[PDB]
Design a protein around this ligand. Structure first.
Ligand code: 1VD
Length: 354
């Protein structure tokens, strides 16, 4: 009656990643870092319904912020009832600016991915009936339905990636490369095949929270109804690692600070360049396939190389950032690359950095 636990098939680096991205402590840390009350909102109690209600609560606040309706205090108080927060048992603050509204929308987006990782781990029926089970880390890896292949130092893309990291990361304290995995999330293949005629492909950084990595591996980079930011409702990338790194929180592990960053192949097609913030965008202007909020600098284009991925040439920057005189007055210090359809990105690499 005792089930056999089969030996783990994963290399140590992958075991570590799979431990990290499903870690209950990591998820709870992330909740504490977003001011959530983890005692009142434990991981096993998070539900899709709760999250839905929280978004409805924010929708009502958004309406008030743009009549005799409920005050921002009352409507905040509703939100906090739905999504418990911890501010050392003082009374949480009213959501009364566009900036704070987007911060709460972004918190719930993170929480939605935490809930997905929990839902994903639910033990199925066939699992209750089989007499042998995979090692927990094999099981968790398999749940992702995503192939990860750890690269070594002499993989053809390895030096190119390392160069992109080193040349466009922070000058004074560049993240240290630990591992690179090739990511093959199948069922990304077909939608991305759609844009095969679209030239102008670029390999671009997307940094995130450790708490959303499992979700990204299962489903790709996604746009939600409440997605937002300086260039509107799309998926954000950067050509400078240092820009994307600003979005990595990174978890203390022993004496190290561990973080994860993706590289996506983005079919940018015909680019629309802007130089001022537009949080209201929901697509490129007619006739364009992307929006690039152009920064004061860009990785030196004269140093761009290419990789061949699924038979397509994909541009990879290799240059240190240089000034772009035409965009010296831009509201953006560094470029943000936007797509507004999920099919225009395919995940290609995952990097662990310390
Ligand atoms: C709030 C979080 N957003 C991010 O992780 C954005 C990270 C990021 N932002 C950038 C902005 C400008 C330039 C670069 C970056 C970047 O590299 N990463 C998030 C957004 C959407 C979702 N999501 C999607 C579907 N369900 C939840 C989950 C988490």
């Amino acid at each position: 009656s005792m089930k056999r636990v089969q030996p783990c098939s994963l290399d140590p680096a992958t075991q570590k990643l799979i431990t990290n991205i499903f870690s209950k402590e990591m998820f709870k840390n992330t909740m504490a870092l977003m001011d959530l009350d983890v005692k009142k909102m434990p991981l096993g109690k998070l539900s899709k319904q709760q999250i839905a209600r929280g978004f409805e609560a924010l929708e009502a606040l958004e309406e008030a912020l743009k009549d005799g309706g409920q005050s921002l205090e009352e409507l905040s108080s509703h939100f906090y009832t739905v999504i418990p927060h911890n501010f050392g048992h003082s009374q949480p603050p009213p959501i009364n600016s566009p900036e704070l509204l987007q911060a709460k929308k972004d918190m719930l987006l993170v929480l939605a991915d935490i809930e997905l990782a929990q839902a994903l781990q639910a033990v199925s029926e066939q699992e209750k009936t089989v007499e042998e089970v995979p090692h927990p880390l094999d099981r968790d890896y398999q749940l992702l339905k995503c192939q990860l292949q750890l690269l070594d130092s002499g993989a053809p893309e390895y030096k190119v990636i390392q160069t992109y990291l080193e040349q466009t990361g922070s000058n004074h304290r560049c993240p240290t490369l630990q591992h690179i995995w090739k990511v093959n999330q199948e069922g990304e293949e077909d939608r991305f095949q759609a844009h095969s005629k679209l030239g102008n492909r670029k390999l671009l950084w997307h940094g995130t929270n450790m708490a959303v990595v499992a979700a990204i591996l299962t489903s790709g980079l996604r746009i939600m109804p409440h997605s937002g930011g300086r260039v509107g409702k799309g998926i954000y990338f950067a050509s400078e690692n240092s820009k994307s790194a600003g979005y990595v929180i990174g978890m203390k592990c022993g004496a190290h600070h561990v973080g994860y960053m993706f590289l996506g192949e983005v079919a940018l097609g015909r680019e629309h360049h802007i130089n001022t913030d537009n949080p209201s965008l929901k697509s490129p202007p007619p006739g364009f396939d992307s929006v690039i909020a152009r920064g004061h600098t860009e990785p030196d284009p004269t140093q761009d190389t290419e990789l061949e991925l699924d038979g397509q040439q994909v541009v990879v920057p290799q240059g240190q950032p240089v000034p772009c005189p035409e965009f010296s007055s831009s509201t953006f210090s560094q470029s943000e690359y936007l797509i507004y359809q999920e099919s225009q990105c395919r995940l290609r690499y995952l990097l662990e950095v310390h």
